Amino acid sequence: NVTVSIPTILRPHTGGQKSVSASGDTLGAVISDLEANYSGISERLMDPSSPGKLHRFVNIYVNDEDVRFSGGLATAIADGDSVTILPAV
């Protein structure tokens, strides 16, 4: 049980839900899980150029920690952690 906050731009993939539930031990695992339930979400978060690397203009925090500082998709994920996707500015 982790909660994922979805930014306005990606709510189509989630039937307009602001927030959805997911699970995985890593950010990677949570991403492909959301994909599982909410088709098309995933390509929008990844860099089209190089695999496994997040998109230049997307931010993702696991609980207030920027994943770019904790291993990106390898970033470890605990029960009741929260995840937050946001367009970069």
Swiss-Prot record:
One of its GO terms (biological process) is cysteine biosynthetic process. InterPro entries: Beta-grasp_dom_sf, Mopterin_synth/thiamin_S_b, Sulfur_Carrier/Prot_Modifier, ThiS/MoaD-like. One of its GO terms (cellular component) is protein-containing complex. Keywords: Amino-acid biosynthesis, Cysteine biosynthesis. Pathway: Amino-acid biosynthesis; L-cysteine biosynthesis. Signal peptide: none annotated. Pfam families: ThiS (PF02597). Thiocarboxylated by MoeZ. It comes from the Bacteria. SUPFAM superfamilies: MoaD/ThiS (SSF54285). CDD domains: Ubl_CysO_like. Induction: Up-regulated under oxidative stress conditions. Belongs to the sulfur carrier protein CysO family. In its thiocarboxylated form (CysO-COSH), is the sulfur donor in the CysM-dependent cysteine biosynthetic pathway. May be of particular importance for cysteine biosynthesis in the persistent phase of M.tuberculosis. This is Sulfur carrier protein CysO. It comes from Mycobacterium tuberculosis (strain ATCC 25618 / H37Rv).
